[PDB]
């Protein structure tokens, strides 16, 4: 080598050095896919609101318990999404967000369950299920003006399982009610997968300000899990 | 208007397609294999270059 | 009791079982590793080596059981196979409980687990206890020999034999010293790091079948570590709290070893 | 609006301490080698000098090797000289220069002011010191090293620079025939591994100054006498 | 409605009518004659390890050295591949690049993605650090390719199944070309400059006249999407890769598919396709790890290259025609000839 040789190499050296401060920083924090049809309130799952880089795809950061959490919506285009998916598929969990107080569009939210799913690339990636919008739910179920078995039939058919814990002491109907919505989109996850990746679902309200945590909890077991399989203990 | 501006698309495909129906599959099929056996002696990947000149010695 | 042909017996089918598994789990293990590095894969490359270490100087003590005590190659090869052979059980119960702090930690502190995951760190540890047992031995060896050659005894009109007509009072603090720090306090971190990731398998549920597959193979794991290498360190101990107790116990825990060397990659190997 | 001004020259006595600052300003400083070049008050160029970037490399001269000290202040983008042991010697102008090194880089690009200080190895041969010239025709310049400069890898280090009357220098051609960037193209480079001309097809009245070679294979850096052009 | 269905109907058949019609003779019976070119064995002599994630984009400078590479850890990198030198490490703005560019003056370097923002960086500054030149305007889509006509027009293509052409002085669009029905994910330029050929979600590829901006032919023939495409060096063919495992050549003049390049053992998609300097080898990467080299005339694997550790994203052959280099989804970049 010559001199300028000799001080190329130093540079490439420096450059490689910023490279693993910088790849080290980064893999320090947590990202998230958020998916989810509009009108469910996909935005507000997280009370605090950001406009990062709000050019092309959305970004939000939100910390808990001194960890951040990177949330990226790809909001900018209501087409076909089978294709910039496949950038998303190293993300820690997707997010996805389902309305459950309307029962029109909810065969269509199953759908696009099922399309996430089973997906090529994401077949290693855990879906946090966020059932948005449970009191209109009841509200509506109270009310028997519309019905659920004007598009599930099985609801008639379905009863409330032996270990159903209905905490907050509300109508056993709209126990009913959740539970079978909760079964149609676990059935749907259940039946692929085979335990490499795993469903959370979870029920929540506009007004719920608590849903960070789950988001934190749930993908801390996805964490544990993913240790758990490098030592081969799964 | 997406009908009528796809007919007239379709016209242009007829029209760039005329000198098409003109050229010959068989014809072009022999220009290809014209230019790959007169540049087929300048592309190291086809014919390996000796080590001398390759860049890329260990 | 000691039946020089079963000792012999048990001995060569210990070996022939052994090493053709373990070359196999070896092989599964680099075979892992090839594709990427985690800390687990360098705890069982680092266990594979010790293995076939302690499962090529079998053979050697293999033959001395069927000379009942005599070694008929020369005394000049004593230390060789004294450390060829002593040191890979010691070995082995320092891997594992490195093994099991490793799942315990990544059971129970997953973020912080993988905010700082690196195979370096494993070789780092690997290799402190790899120097820290070397150096122990060496140190408790040194005041073994009397400068006969040294590693070597020989009694009265009697062949020579490795250590086992060794001084008994002289070989009871020191093998009762050695055996504890190198055993009871790997026993005891893997001990806690088995309750440790137990709990946090059962707080962190996922499906019942597979929380009690990983809790078998994590016990797997602590059991092959309790139930071969530990009759050794308790005859050991045993021997030096009673100094006039009769030496085949000494004889059983060896054989015990012998059983580790098998049973230690069925449990815990890759493949 | 690349800038570097440097500051602390000064009449001083023989054997005494000093200290040379250079500010730079209008350029990422921390990514750029920098050089200190001594010019004595009637001689030529002389490399005194090298912080690398980052501090990784430092390269001295012998004649000032061990009582000079070069170092480098990235956040307030400064560079300091501590002279110690002044010499009768050691006055000089003592430029201070910019440098960068990647595959297409062109080092010695910037050059700064120069503080006049005042007290109380491969070769360059230039065959010419002065060359009278009229405006409008072609002129050239040789110079000769004692080493060829050409590498294995095919690059051979010589560089050329002209100093106007009044003026720090500037670089021309930093390689064999490489121009330099804001150099009329008027201006070429040529020759074999060991002699080296610059061409010059048309001359005008700011082409007048001193020419100097420079080499670059190895350290330490050596500079040629000088060839002075002036109109006629 | 109707009406007008019948009109393009008609207009359907009679197109393909001509298409059988200028077909006499396959190309492989044409090819028939001539010996196979052989097994290709080609050996890594650089790997590159400086990416910290996965990588989507690479490509070679004019002066054969010099390449330029994009992945999500949000950095473009430029390597001197004959000394595995990083010259330039770039931040940007958007970690989610799916593009890069490299400009044939060696001045410029453009990437883009799910921003929706083609930026161009400027290397040769008088600071010293390489800085953003302009962020180009908004697409309506993510950006999945773009290229340098010279040091002053960009040519682009989104997922708003439209491609553009743009002056990076004024920053506007100078041109914007007609719509496909899916998305735009490949684009490749004439040796010439003067057309370009895109390819599309919908399974077809359209070649498109860069000075009038209107679509001069169609190609079809495709199953899935359409991932990769490059012209033959020649500029009078191309190729292209799809998710249905297999890879086209159609020809422009005879405007209808030459060959097809398939294997009953290969089902993953295609990710990446380049010619060689003599347009004799066609290398494709694939979704299986490892990129394949057929035989462009005889279309039988001559070669595998099968070096990667996970999918192979980019591929690109240098201008002189020295070397390969495969970027995967391992973070690595291999240098073959
Ligand atoms: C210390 C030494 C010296 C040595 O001299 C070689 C000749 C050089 S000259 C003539 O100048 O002396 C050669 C070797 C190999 C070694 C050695 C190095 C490392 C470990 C061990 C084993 O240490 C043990 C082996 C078994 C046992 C030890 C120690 O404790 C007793 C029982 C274990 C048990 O029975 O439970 C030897």
């Known amino acids: 080598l010559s001199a300028e040789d000799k001080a190329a190499v130093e540079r490439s050296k420096m450059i490689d050095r910023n490279l693993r401060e910088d790849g080290e920083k980064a893999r320090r924090t947590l990202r998230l896919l958020l998916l989810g049809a509009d009108n469910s309130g996909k935005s507000t799952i997280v009370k605090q609101m950001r406009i990062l880089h709000t050019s092309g795809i959305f970004e939000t950061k939100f910390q808990v318990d001194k960890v951040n959490f990177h949330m990226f919506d790809v909001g900018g285009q209501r087409d076909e999404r089978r294709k910039w998916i496949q950038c998303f598929n190293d993300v820690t969990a997707i997010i996805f967000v389902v309305d459950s107080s309307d029962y029109n569009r909810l065969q269509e939210a199953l759908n696009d369950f099922k399309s996430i799913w089973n997906n090529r690339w994401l077949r290693t990636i855990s879906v946090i299920l966020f059932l948005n919008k449970q009191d209109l739910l009841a509200e509506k179920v109270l009310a028997g003006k519309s019905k659920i078995e004007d598009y599930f039939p099985e609801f008639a058919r379905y009863t409330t399982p032996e270990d159903a814990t209905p905490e907050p002491g509300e109508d056993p109907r709209v126990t009913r009610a959740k539970y079978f919505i909760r079964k149609e989109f676990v059935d749907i996850s259940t039946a692929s997968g085979d335990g490499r990746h795993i469903c959370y679902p979870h029920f929540t309200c506009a007004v719920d300000t608590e849903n960070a945590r789950r988001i934190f909890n749930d993908c801390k077991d996805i964490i544990l899990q993913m240790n758990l399989r490098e030592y081969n203990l799964v | ?58 | 009791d000691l039946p020089p042909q079963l000792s012999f017996g048990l001995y060569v089918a210990a070996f022939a079982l052994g090493f053709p598994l373990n070359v196999l789990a070896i092989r599964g293990a680099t075979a892992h590793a090839r594709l990427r590095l985690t800390p687990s894969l360098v705890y069982a490359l680092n266990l594979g080596c010790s293995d076939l270490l302690l499962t090529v100087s079998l053979p050697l003590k293999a033959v001395e059981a069927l000379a009942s005590g005599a070694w008929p190659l020369p005394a000049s090869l004593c230390p060789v196979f004294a450390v060829a052979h002593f040191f890979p059980l010691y070995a082995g119960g320092g891997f594992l409980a490195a093994l099991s702090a490793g799942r315990y930690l990544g059971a129970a502190f997953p973020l912080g687990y993988q905010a700082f995951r690196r195979p370096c760190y494993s070789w780092g540890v690997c290799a402190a206890i790899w120097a820290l047992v070397l150096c122990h031995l060496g140190l408790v060896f040194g005041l073994e020999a009397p400068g006969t050659s040294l590693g070597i005894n020989t009694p009265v009109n009697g062949s020579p034999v490795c250590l086992e007509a060794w001084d008994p009072a002289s070989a009871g603090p020191a093998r009762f010293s050695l055996s504890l720090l190198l055993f009871f306090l790997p026993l005891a971190i893997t001990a806690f790091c088995y309750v440790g990731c137990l709990r946090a398998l059962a707080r962190s549920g996922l499906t019942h079948r597979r929380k009690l597959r990983a809790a078998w193979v994590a016990g797997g794991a602590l059991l092959t570590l309790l139930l071969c290498v530990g009759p050794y360190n308790a005859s050991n101990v045993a021997s030096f709290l009673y100094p006039n107790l009769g030496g085949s116990w000494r004889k059983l825990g060896l054989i015990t070893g012998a059983w580790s060397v098998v049973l230690n990659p069925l449990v815990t190997g890759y493949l | 609006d690349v800038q570097l001004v440097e500051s602390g020259g000064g009449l001083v006595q023989p054997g005494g301490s000093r200290k040379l600052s250079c500010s730079a300003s209008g350029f990422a400083f921390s990514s750029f080698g920098m050089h200190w070049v001594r010019q004595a008050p009637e001689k030529g160029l002389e490399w005194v000098a090298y912080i690398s970037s980052g501090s990784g490399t430092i390269y001295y001269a012998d004649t000032v090797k061990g009582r000079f000290t070069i170092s480098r202040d990235d956040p307030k983008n400064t560079l300091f000289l501590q002279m110690t042991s002044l010499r009768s010697e050691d006055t000089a102008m003592y430029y201070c220069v910019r440098s960068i090194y990647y595959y297409g880089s062109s080092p010695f690009d910037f050059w700064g002011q120069g503080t006049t200080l005042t007290v109380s190895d491969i070769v360059m041969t230039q065959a010419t010191s002065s060359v009278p010239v009229t405006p409008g025709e072609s002129v050239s310049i040789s110079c000769r090293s004692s080493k060829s400069l050409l590498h294995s890898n095919g690059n051979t280090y010589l560089y050329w620079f002209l100093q106007r009357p009044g003026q720090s220098p500037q670089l021309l051609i930093y390689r064999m025939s490489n121009l330099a960037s804001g150099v009329p193209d008027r201006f070429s480079g040529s020759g074999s591994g060991t002699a080296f001309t610059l061409t010059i097809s048309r001359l005008e009245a700011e082409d007048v100054g001193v020419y100097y070679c420079m080499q670059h294979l190895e350290y330490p850096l050596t500079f040629g006498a000088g060839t002075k052009l002036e109109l006629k | 409605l109707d009406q007008l269905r019948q009109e393009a109907e008609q207009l359907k058949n009679q197109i393909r009518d001509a298409r059988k019609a200028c077909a006499d003779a396959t190309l492989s019976q044409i090819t028939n004659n001539i010996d196979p070119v052989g097994r290709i064995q080609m050996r890594t002599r650089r790997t590159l390890r400086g990416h910290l994630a996965k990588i989507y984009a690479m490509h070679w400078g004019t002066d054969s050295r010099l390449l330029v590479s994009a992945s999500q850890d949000g950095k473009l990198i430029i390597w001197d591949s004959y000394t595995t030198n990083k010259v330039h490490a770039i931040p940007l703005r958007s970690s989610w690049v799916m593009t890069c560019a490299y400009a044939p003056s060696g001045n410029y370097v453009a990437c883009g993605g799910l921003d929706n923002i083609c930026s161009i960086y400027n290397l040769k500054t008088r600071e010293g650090n390489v800085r953003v030149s302009r962020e180009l305007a908004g697409h309506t889509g993510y950006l999945s390719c773009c290229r340098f006509l010279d040091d002053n027009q960009i040519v682009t293509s989104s997922g708003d199944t439209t491609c553009a052409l743009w002056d990076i002085e004024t920053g506007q669009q100078t041109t914007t070309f007609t719509g496909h029905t899916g998305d735009v994910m490949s684009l490749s330029l004439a040796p010439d400059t003067r057309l370009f050929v895109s390819g599309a979600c919908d399974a077809s590829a359209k070649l498109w006249d860069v000075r009038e901006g209107m679509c001069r032919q169609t190609f079809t023939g495709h199953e899935s999407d359409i991932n990769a495409i490059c012209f033959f060096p020649n500029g009078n063919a191309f190729a292209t890769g799809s998710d249905d495992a297999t890879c086209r050549l159609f020809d422009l003049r005879a405007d209808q598919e030459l060959m097809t390049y398939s294997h009953d053992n290969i089902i993953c998609g295609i990710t990446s396709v380049s010619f060689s300097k003599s347009g004799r080898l066609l290398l494709a990467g694939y979704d299986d790890f490892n990129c394949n080299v057929w035989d462009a005339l005889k279309a039988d694997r001559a070669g595998v290259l099968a070096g990667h550790d996970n999918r192979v994203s980019c591929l690109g052959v240098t201008d002189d025609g020295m070397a390969v280099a495969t970027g995967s989804w391992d973070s690595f970049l291999k240098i073959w000839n």
């Open chain 2, 1 to 58: 208007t997406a009908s009528i501006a796809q007919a007239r698309k379709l016209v242009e495909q007829l029209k760039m397609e005329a000198n098409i129906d003109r050229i010959k599959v068989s014809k072009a099929a022999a220009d290809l294999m014209a230019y790959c056996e007169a540049h087929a002696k300048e592309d190291p990947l086809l014919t390996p270059v000796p080590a001398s000149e390759n860049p890329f010695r260990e």
